[PDB]
Each structure stands twice: as structure tokens, then as C-alpha cells.
């Protein structure tokens, strides 16, 4: 069974995709960007932007019968790898106890010209 | 069991990889590029190029006992994010009913200097 | 059950992540870079750098009750796609018999300004 996930506490998915999709115990979360649930961009520091991305992921996971503690793998895409040090401070605050596998890469550009995008693969609770 | 997949209706894999690999109900499809099954590049619009990538994915999925409707997650890599609007028109045509999770990023370069690469994770029918 | 993996025969993970994480038969390996297990960068040819990345992945897999022969999907990120030909020679040497699915993309930058990063998804033996 493939089950799409929708929450009002993350920016809405466009017509062609879902915020997350569940398949046999796994939860695949779409790449989250620094936008509020009302679909407005977060302006400010990378730290503020990272915190929004984390809240977006967390809320989609909660709707997926999952949580940060059930994440298996995180992929981080940064528009500028110079921002990695700052991003990592926020990342470490969230993954203080649970330590999923991770990959981080510097990309040329991201949707809507944002500074970061983060996708996650998790398991159901 | 890990089962490699081969179809003559997508560009052939090189010696070191498989077009797709199956593992416990999941199908992992290699990143598909805008090349025809005869291994020639598609020249033309991003729309034409995206349509070829979609046909490549669809045909590999069919050989994998899967289909577009069984996709869990799509990752789109674009050489230029300015092409995203055009790409999205084609994407939305295919994912008109089934809405997998998605991530899209702008990369510096792609194999054989192509404009787009798309990988997919699916489940068996 | 989510089980983190640690080996002394790959560069140590930082505090916020694990070298690999196991979840229901799958092993998700963090993106490996050309650093030795003593956390020093490999200087030299792309071939030498690729060989180090391969040894890092192999050793994490071994600690994960897996191996190269149990890999389902490989994602290769290169800081310069001009290095792909050279990388591929090393890749083909390792995947001489087992042929997982693969995606390869050229990125803007990688952690610690390295030339390549490779992540892998595998199954347990």
C-alpha cells in the first residue's frame, strides 16, 4: 500500500506531488525548504531557515505516524556550502540523541531560489 | 534477493551498473537521462527531453514488475533550475493521479552534459 | 529497530550522525569522502581518492553485516564531472560482478572541499 501524507502544519504540496509517501513501514518525505505553512518564504539567518525546515519535516513525520527519532537517512542540499557550519549547529540540536545516516552536498540552485532543502527517509513508529 | 533489471526499451546500462535493481519489494531505478533506447541523445525542448526520461523510467519499471503508479519517491536533478517550470508541466501530466514524494535540485553538471536526470524508487505491483 | 553502525576502519562520524544506520534489512550508509580512518584527507589522483571512498564504504558495510555484493543503489556526487571518466575506471573494478542501480551528478561543492562523495543503500547478508 502506498499512502500519501498531508499536513496543514507544513507548506502545502503542489498538485503533482505529496509532502510524504508511505510504503511498507518506510516514510519518504519530500525535500522541505524554508517556507512557513502559509507558503511564505522565511527571510533571515541560515539558522532561522534551518529551524523552519526542521519544523516542516517534523510535522510531516508526525502526520506519517513517525518522528525525528525514527529517521533512517537525511539528505541535505545547500545552495552554498559556506553555510554548512551554521546549518550544522541547528542540525546537531535536533539530532542530539538519535543519529541517522546523513549526506550533505552543495548544489547550484534550489527551488524558488532557497538556501537549503532537506529530505528524509524514516520508519513508522 | 537482489535482482537486476534490463529492458531494451530504455538506453542500455554500461558494464558497471544496472538500469534498475530490486530488493525486498522495492525497485531502485538508475538516474535516467534524455537518451533514446538506441543510445542517442534527444535534442530539442526541455519538454521533449523530459518526455524521453519519463518513457525510460516507465519502461524500466514495467520490466521490474512495477509502474508509475507504484512510485514512492522521485528525485529530479536539473542542470538549470530555470528549466523547472517547463519540466513541471510534463511531470504533472504523468503524475496526474498518483502523487509520490519528490525532491528537485539544480546541479552543476550531469553525465554526458544532459539537461536533466531523474531517479525513482518504486514498489513491485 | 534502527541500529547505528560504527567502525574504526572508516573516518569517524561527527556527533550528529552515524556512519551507517540499519532499518528492516536495509543499510543506509552516509556519504563517504576521500579521507583515511585517521581523519586525514587523501591527496592525489581521483583514482586514489575513489579507492579510499570505496574502502570506507566497504568497511562500514562489513560492520553493518553487509558487503559490496549486497548494495542495491549507489549515488555518486562529483565536484567536477570531468573527473567522471577516471572515477568510472575505479568504480568498474569494484562492481565487476555485482551491478547495483546508480546515479551520478556534478555538484557545486562537497563537505571539506573534497572531489567526490559516495553514498550507498545495501541489504543485510
From Swiss-Prot, chains A, B, C:
The record's annotation in Pfam families points to:
Ribonuc_L-PSP
Cellular compartment(s): Mitochondrion matrix
Listed under GO cellular component are: cytosol; mitochondrial matrix; mitochondrion
Q: What is its main location?
A: mitochondrion
- Record-annotated disulphide pairs: none
InterPro entries per UniProt: RidA, RidA_CS, RutC-like_sf, YjgF/YER057c/UK114
An annotated GO BP: isoleucine biosynthetic process
Annotated keywords:
Mitochondrion, Transit peptide
Extract the GO molecular function terms from the UniProt entry. Answer: deaminase activity
Name the protein family: Belongs to the RutC family.
Query: Which function does this protein serve?
Result: Plays a role in the maintenance of mitochondrial DNA.
What remark does the entry add?
A: Present with 168000 molecules/cell in log phase SD medium.
Q: Any idea what this protein is called? A: Protein MMF1, mitochondrial
Gene behind this protein: MMF1
